[PDB]
Structure formats: structure tokens, C-alpha cells
Design a protein around this ligand. Structure first.
Ligand SMILES: OC[C@H]1O[C@@H](O[C@@H]2[C@@H](O)[C@H](O[C@H]3[C@H](O)[C@@H](O)[C@H](O[C@H]4[C@H](O)[C@@H](O)[C@@H](O)O[C@@H]4CO)O[C@@H]3CO)O[C@H](CO)[C@H]2O)[C@H](O)[C@@H](O)[C@@H]1O
Length: 206
């Protein structure tokens, strides 16, 4: 009993696109780091250049410092951002409180499956690991190696369309009178959200 016998499959996300405002996204593939910045310019959004059909997705993430009230930073899967009938699976940080994270998923445009989780840490205090495990009848969310939520196919729809990996930072303060992410204060810009060692499924790109 010397070798670790534990079964251990993922590949680094090498190729990404930026959907708007590329000046507020940086990619350093040589250090496996992507950053997103929120400031006057209005944020940005990156994504994988390919869709995937199921698999495990992960990133180290360090959220922005300072007063992030109003902001939404995230990492998520979506069949197509902006599609009214999208399938999706979310990690969304709510800027009013950097010690929580919200999970959610969408089936043919329908969400309303929010859950709020206590992180046990400040998400801007160093890099932490966020994982989405997406299967045909089981979705799991992991944080620093621990499952924080599991949902199984319950007959009320399930994400099954091929999906892009996405990440953005945006001002969500207009949602629910600012009660969701807080009012936007925005006096600590640039708000820099960092993604490191983003990994995608080995063999499910479609
Ligand atoms: O131009 C006026 C106004 O524009 C602002 O920038 C907006 C920006 O707010 C918007 O953010 C998207 C974001 O890119 C996207 O990732 C996010 O996706 C959601 C998804 O819709 C949900 O279903 C769920 O899965 O969770 C995801 C992650 O939160 O949705 C937001 C909101 O639509 O993107 C648009 C471009 O498409 C962009 O114009 C800008 O900040 C302001 O300064 C400006 O006034």
C-alpha cells in the first residue's frame, strides 16, 4: 500500500471565445488563467468554443475584492446564452455576500431551482475549487472537493442539450429591487474575477 489506488479524467480548457467587451477579459493560457473585470465598461463574458454533451467541468476561482454589492460573478453551463429555451447549470455568486453561492439549473427556459449555500469562507479570499458534474440523470455541484448539492432527474425536465461552459461578471442589482445581489455601489472597480486551471470533459465535445 504505497501507490494511491484511487481512480483518477479531464482536460484543460485551451480554447475560449469572448462574447463582448474583450478589453475586460484577459487570457494567459501559459499560466492557465482567465480574468474578467467589471468597471465602467460593463463587464465581459467568456466561453468554451465548443459545446459538450455531459461531463465534469471545473475551475479554481477567486472572486473580486472590495464591496461587490450588486455584482454577479459566476461559472455556468448553457446551451446558448440568451436563448429563451435554454438548458443550463449555474454557480452564481451574489455580490452582497461573498460568503454564499447560489446554485440553479434550467430546463427548456425554466429555472426557479435556486439554492443558497454557505461557503464557509469568503470567495474572494484566495482561489477555491468549483465543480459541476453533469450527467443524464444526475447533476452535482462541488466546492473545494465536497458535494454541496445533488439533483436527480425527477420527471420535471432535466438539462440534456449540449452546452457551452460560460463565465461572466455583470451588474445584477436591477433584479428584484436589488434584493437578490444587493444595490450596486461600485466604488472599488476594477472588480477582477480570476479563473485558473479551467478543465472540461475529455471526450464529450460535440
Ligand atoms: O448595455 C446596457 C448595459 O449592458 C450591461 O452588460 C450586459 C450584461 O449585464 C449582460 O450580462 C449577462 C451575462 O453576460 C450572462 O452571463 C448572464 O447569464 C446568466 C443567464 O442568463 C441565466 O439564465 C443564468 O444561467 O445565469 C447566468 C449567469 O448569471 O446574464 C447576464 C444578464 O443578461 O450581458 C449583456 C450582453 O448580452 C450585457 O450587454 C452593462 O454592464 C451595463 O453597463 C450597461 O448599462
Amino acid at each position: 500500500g504505497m501507490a494511491d489506488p484511487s481512480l483518477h479524467e479531464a482536460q484543460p480548457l485551451k480554447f475560449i471565445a469572448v462574447d463582448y467587451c474583450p478589453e475586460s477579459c484577459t487570457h494567459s493560457p501559459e499560466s492557465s488563467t482567465i480574468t474578467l473585470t467589471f468597471d465602467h465598461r460593463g463587464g465581459s463574458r467568456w466561453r468554451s468554443t465548443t459545446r459538450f454533451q455531459y461531463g465534469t467541468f471545473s475551475s479554481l476561482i477567486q472572486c473580486p475584492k472590495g464591496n461587490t454589492s450588486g455584482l454577479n460573478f459566476n461559472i455556468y453551463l448553457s446551451s446558448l446564452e440568451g436563448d429563451k429555451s435554454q438548458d443550463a447549470i449555474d454557480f452564481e455568486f451574489l455580490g452582497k455576500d461573498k460568503r454564499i453561492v447560489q446554485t440553479n439549473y434550467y430546463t427548456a427556459g425554466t429555472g426557479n431551482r435556486e439554492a443558497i449555500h454557505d461557503l464557509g469562507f469568503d470567495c474572494s479570499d484566495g482561489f477555491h475549487e468549483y465543480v459541476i458534474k453533469w450527467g443524464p440523470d444526475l447533476i452535482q455541484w462541488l466546492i473545494d472537493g465536497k458535494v454541496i448539492r445533488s439533483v436527480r432527474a425527477d420527471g420535471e425536465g432535466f438539462p440534456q442539450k449540449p452546452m457551452f461552459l460560460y463565465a461572466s461578471v455583470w451588474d445584477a442589482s436591477y433584479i428584484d429591487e436589488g434584493r437578490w445581489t444587493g444595490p450596486y455601489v461600485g466604488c472599488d472597480a476594477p472588480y477582477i474575477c480570476l479563473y485558473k486551471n479551467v478543465n472540461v470533459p475529455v471526450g464529450t465535445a460535440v
